[PDB]
Amino acid sequence: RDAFDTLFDHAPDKLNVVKKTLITFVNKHLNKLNLEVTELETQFADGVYLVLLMGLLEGYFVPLHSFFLTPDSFEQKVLNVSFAFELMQDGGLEKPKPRPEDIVNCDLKSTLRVLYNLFTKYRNVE
Amino acid sequence: NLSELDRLLLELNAV
């Protein structure tokens, strides 16, 4: 159990604060690649933006041969997410709480936990 | 940048 379980159970009306903050953070970076997220619920599920965001934040060039830019199956999306989780740990973040499948399945709690951990680590990156 | 998110999570952790 963590603050996100308490958020959904006891303060679900504060979810907009959470999503607005995280959306603003992710777009600050994705905008540099001519990319833009308009909803956290679905737009990270295929793993592509997560991979691209990590490469950007860490200054690693992520080669296209390393992931699936246009995933066409559940398993390609799971592989993208897993690789993004790998890059997170290469950045010095701890192992994420959610399984990669939870992200692919659009579990909002899982998505928020993952983006929040990026936020807290990379909040000062211009 | 300041964020009310930080205080929100702190308060939720305290519960």
Residue numbers in the entry:
A (entry chain B): 247 to 372
B (entry chain A): 1 to 15
Please quote the authors directly:
The adaptor protein paxillin contains five conserved leucine-rich (LD) motifs that interact with a variety of focal adhesion proteins, such as α-parvin. α-parvin (Olski et al., 2001), also known as actopaxin or CH-ILKBP (Tu et al., 2001), is part of the ILK signaling complex (Tu et al., 2001), plays an essential role in adhesion-dependent PKB/Act activation (Fukuda et al., 2003) and in the regulation of actin organization (LaLonde et al., 2005) and Rac activation (LaLonde et al., 2005; Zhang et al., 2004). It belongs to the highly conserved parvin family that shares a common architecture composed of a variable N-terminal region followed by two CH domains (Olski et al., 2001). Our results demonstrate that full-length α-parvin contains a single LD binding site, formed by the N-linker helix, helix A, and helix G of the C-terminal type-5 CH domain.
To elucidate the molecular basis for LD recognition by α-parvin-CHC, we cocrystallized α-parvin-CHC with peptides representing the high-affinity ligands LD1, LD2, and LD4. The refined structures include residues 247–372 of α-parvin and paxillin residues 1–14, 141–155, and 262–274 for LD1, LD2, and LD4, respectively. All three LD motifs bind to the same binding site on α-parvin-CHC formed by the N-linker helix, the N-terminal part of helix A and the C-terminal part of helix G, which is consistent with our results from chemical shift mapping. Surprisingly, however, the orientation of LD1 is reversed compared to LD2 and LD4 in the corresponding crystal structures. Despite their antiparallel orientations, however, the binding modes of different LD peptides are very similar. The side chains of their conserved leucine residues in position 0, +3, +4, and +7 interact with a hydrophobic patch on the surface of the CHC domain formed by residues from the N-linker helix (A249, F250, L253, A257), helix A (V263, V264, and L268) and helix G (Y362 and F365). In addition, two positively charged residues (K260 and R369) of α-parvin-CHC are in close proximity to negatively charged residues of the bound LD peptides. Note that these electrostatic contacts involve the conserved aspartate D+1 of the LD consensus in the case of LD2 and LD4, whereas D+6 and E+8 are utilized in LD1. Consistent with their similar binding modes, all three LD peptides, irrespective of directionality, impose similar conformational changes in the N-terminal region of α-parvin-CHC, whereas the protein core remains virtually unperturbed. Residues 258–260 of helix A, which are α-helical in the unbound conformation, adopt a 310-helix in the complexes.
